[PDB]
Design a protein around this ligand. Structure first.
Ligand SMILES: [Fe+3]
Ligand SMILES: [Fe+3]
Ligand SMILES: [Fe+3]
Ligand SMILES: [Fe+3]
Lengths: 238, 200, 238, 200, 238, 200, 200
């Protein structure tokens, strides 16, 4: 069973977005009005699931092949890779990375998505992967397109990929969005502007990585994710 | 002072979180192995219980696109970290409320007692993380049991909430759904009766 | 009796901290949602008590000796002195200055403080003093230590001394907090961050004052306080 | 424009305010002379009255660490500023609500009428300044009496509050505590029935 | 036995404080007037003791408990941790770190200190620790207070902790002093001013480390130490 | 050029060095294991000798707060680095002069010969590091013996000191303390007869 | 920290200080009233004594252009601050060594005992300030008496000098010049026998 040997560096809630960010309209009715209650970390918060024996299908990380109904998805072929480290710069091995996204025209494969850009019959939009010993993960997918949504009357989400990362405990679990370098829609989105500090926005942006590209084939983006720093307990209960 | 690397900031799970994290609840085909709402197989040790609830926004309206993840000790107070669909009990699980299913459900066992870091026993609980569109960084909460009144009275976690009326929002009310023991646990994100949410 | 012959410069409510400053958690449920209603100054707001005849004990301003159970307090021996003036630079004589603080380890002498740093059997934590004809006050005490509190999960109040100043009227009365020059906890404390302008924060930082130090005995800090300016009425009711 | 020196900024009085300002209440030893809650001595002229109240936060919960300072005229309408523990009446006083005592009390005499700057009489009132943990800068309010309805209806201060229903939050209710004439003044910091607070 | 197989980078005698620094008065009669004579490194200078087998008591590194006469010391509870590396960045494992300091009021537990701040009956002022395999050490203690001394007429030593580090040889051994971030006494102390370059002063300033702090219990400071770099011999005697 | 990370700068050991490094000397209680002045146990091989000396400042006054660390080979010429209080010989030790004791003493055995890097033998020597209030960075010196005049005249270290009269400051004088063989090594920090100090 | 206005820096009194401060010793005409070396008129109360000395530089050579100012209590331990040439005793005086007169002289009385600020008695002394060309900021010193051995042993000022040999440089040696009691007090600015100099 899991043991209480770690402590995680407290989260900086002025760095992450606040709960109430009115320009993102849906946050108004879905943000708590009472202060969060702080509690010490116990074995309930410092352990979490290990997905090492989850049985992964061979194409679960490969979006160009895991849906497949006859051929290839239409759109810019890309590798999105990176590494997961903790705030002390220590690789986080064997952790679960899940991702989901729209198709090349910003349509998502979901019933409630009624945007008029057609579905791509060979694209599903979902992958999962386990980081390796060094904290590396990689996916192969098509770059998604931006799409409109009912927020302000002409709001458009920049092209993005959602990420969910487990880390070593439920204290480190995080869901975020990756964005693409240079997309001029980035500073105008109210969801990205829920982040008050511009240096925090920068961490959400995948940089073009021509070193990892496959020539005559696909480009590559690099996105490194930093989870809460983990340290051994010292001097507790005396 | 000493500055470490900053944590990647959070973003909302967005409206279609289900397509990436609740394949079935999104009505899409599933893969061979999915992380879902059935923590205990029928023959696992402990009191089996059914959990259910709705989630409300600040205007009293039902949140129908929420996604939830749970972490709990098994019936002897031990966190089983090795997730495997073969095991009779996993400590981790995921569920969701959808357009069709306004209510979420989990099938598990009543967790046993664990100690906090000073060795004081905590009342049986379930750790819940809530994500949804409109929620910029997920909400952590804990589900306690109305029939564990004595241990709830001494839980060093429930005691850190100043106001006695607010600790009641973390207490799940026992009921029966088909001759099976079930606890109801509604979550009010905002307003009258707001569920307590933690930071750690 | 007291007579209405002064007016006080209106308070700058953007210089002082606002009522709702959500990082300071307790302020969320303790701040008014309706606006303050403005009322002209009358004899009820422009007069106030005078404390010249209050019976001060001889060690009221000397915290190294005013509690004393058989010794001296353990901690950095300091003098905290300064002057109380108004916004015109006019000294405020014979006014009441009260203060209270934690001990050297950060424990405060009150039943509800359960912090594990011990109590010091020779230290009380309270002082009072009346300013002199030129507006000077002075107390001797030990430097308080910082303490943790239940706000965020790892919040720590910088070393501070609480001060309360009556001034010439209820319109001028003020409760504040002194901080110590150079303390690296000052910019991370949410209570100090309730003050939005960085220039107003500097006004609460007491400065090291080697000139007032007693050599081979105690250091000193200087802390000047500025109350609302006071002016005579002019052209009122014609 | 002309900028004078800025006022020192206000900071909250903190949870342990009782230690420097309400010694007995902090349960600590008192000095010889303390500024406390007995403005009137048994032989002071005017009508002797007991005031009491409770302080609520925006969730409807009691504030048990609040501190209040008061300033009022004597029975003839005069502000006695020279404070002295031997006087029969002092116009100033302090009191507090604690864990023990959720309610503050003040023993004084009903204030006589005073004029505003414009020569117009105000209804009889007690000036109150409220301080506590969570309050960044203290709140000013006025306690008026329900049995002075003719003077209240003409007070030039009470008539600066635009809405009539907000004027009532300032009007203390005559009742009896131990058979003795009393006025109850509950303060609501936030929310439904929020007490009017002033800036001057 | 020890064998001569390393060389150590020569000391920069302009980075370290000089011997004659007249504002520090006692150095006037205690500094050599003839030059240091340079000698090549041999087995006598490149080897040194190893302290792995020394018998450490269990609270040797824990000054909150190692003296203890019935309680806890009064003062700011802190952890002081860090790493010992060489000039190449190579960690120095299993090395000896000693430390000693004043109490919270600045009194030191030695017969000759006649300073009027009292002794703390639960505090000794001494600790030792061996670095770990990665070069980490750590001690828990209370923050010392500043004290006056007989140098100039109003000189006051900033709060400090004396450290002594053995390293792998007598060539590397060093005695120094830790200071605390933000202390306004640091730039006026003549002992600290014996170090002529302002950049070398910064290396002795421990920085506040909120990440290593135990919430609701003790703050932490980080203090990294850098010993002379060590290299293998190459091309010597041919 | 190439710049490595700079070495942490040295600071004086201070007047109270005895408290962290010479416990007994500070007159404080000792721990179980202390690094002190008895390098040799009564059964260690070689010639047993007592060393002693006094330390002078530049005015000719005794330094009564100095601390010394020594490093020497054993009787066969080998540096014993694994320090252990049970060993018969440890090559390292510490001692001190105090108000009480103006003189330091060290109980050891006369070191055998070791070679420099160039294979040339050095005369028998004891490596000394001197620390105190007033010394900003410690002084290195070597203690040699007056009764080893043939090896001293050929030591490649003693011959790097240009002037012959300066070589003598390093040569400890054989004498007898309580009838026991001893070498007196006085150090002069500054001034007439100043002891040679090295940099390496 | 708090910075005050900086003190005007000192400069040397220069070579001809005498023309501005020792009109006679410069051989220039004097004014009606001059501050000079005769502190006590012949009939003033106390033991009258003659003081004399030379002043030496670091090479053993006489300083012949020095200027000196003295401040001392009268025979009852009281500083007379009101300088007036009519008074029988002034606590202040000035003297000098010149090309003609290598030696300075003062005519006063043996001062009585004064207490330091903690009330401990100090041995009888005389405060001396020395100025001359080559001295950038004046040197403060104190003249004690060899025949006050007992009180000199307990003076809290003489005891702050660490080294017993250096306190002897502040002791003036009794002698007789023409049947009159005189104390000799030489001052060595630098080198062997350097007089102690203070800072306050
Ligand atoms: Fe999306
Ligand atoms: Fe406080
Ligand atoms: Fe020290
Ligand atoms: Fe000139």
């Amino acid at each position: 069973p899991a043991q209480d040997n770690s402590r995680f560096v407290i989260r900086d809630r002025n760095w992450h977005p606040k709960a109430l960010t009115p320009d993102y309209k849906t946050s108004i009715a879905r943000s708590p009005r009472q202060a969060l209650v702080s509690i010490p970390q116990s074995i309930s918060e410092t352990t979490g699931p290990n997905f090492s024996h989850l049985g992964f299908g061979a194409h679960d990380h490969d979006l160009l092949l895991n849906f497949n109904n006859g051929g290839l998805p239409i759109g810019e072929r890309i590798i999105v890779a990176g590494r997961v480290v903790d705030q002390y710069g220590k690789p986080v091995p064997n952790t679960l990375v899940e991702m989901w996204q729209a198709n090349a025209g910003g349509r998502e494969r979901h019933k409630n998505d009624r945007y008029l850009a057609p579905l791509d019959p060979n694209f599903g939009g979902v992958g999962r992967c386990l980081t390796d010993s060094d904290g590396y993960y990689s996916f192969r997918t098509i770059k998604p397109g931006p799409y409109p949504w009912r927020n302000g009357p002409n709001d458009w989400r920049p092209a993005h990929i959602h990420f969910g990362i487990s880390g070593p405990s439920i204290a480190t679990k995080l869901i975020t969005q990756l964005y693409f370098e240079g997309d001029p829609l980035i500073p105008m989105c109210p969801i990205v502007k829920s982040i008050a500090n511009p240096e925090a926005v920068q961490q959400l942006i995948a940089k073009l990585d021509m070193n990892n590209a496959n020539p005559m084939d696909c480009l590559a983006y690099r996105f490194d994710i930093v989870l809460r720093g983990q340290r051994k307990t010292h001097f507790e209960n005396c | 002072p000493i500055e470490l690397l900053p944590e990647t900031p959070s973003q909302t799970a967005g409206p279609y979180v289900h397509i990436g994290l609740a394949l079935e609840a999104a009505g899409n085909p599933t893969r061979d192995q999915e992380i879902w709402n059935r923590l205990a197989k029928p023959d696992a040790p402990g009191e089996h219980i059914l959990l259910l609830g709705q989630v409300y926004d600040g205007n009293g309206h039902l949140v129908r696109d929420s996604f939830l993840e749970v972490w709990q000790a098994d019936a002897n107070g031990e966190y089983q970290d090795a997730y495997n669909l073969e095991n009779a009990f996993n400590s981790f699980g995921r569920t969701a409320t959808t357009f069709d299913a306004g209510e979420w459900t989990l099938h598990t066992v009543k967790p046993g007692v664990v100690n906090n870091a000073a060795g004081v026993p905590m009342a049986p609980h379930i750790n819940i993380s809530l994500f949804a569109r409109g929620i910029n960084i997920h909400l952590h909460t804990r589900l306690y049991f109305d029939d564990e009144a004595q241990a709830n009275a001494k839980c060093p976690v429930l005691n850190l909430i100043e106001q006695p009326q607010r600790r009641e929002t973390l207490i799940a009310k026992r009921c029966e759904v088909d001759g099976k023991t079930a606890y109801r646990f509604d979550i009010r994100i905002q307003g009258e009766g707001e569920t307590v949410f933690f930071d750690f």
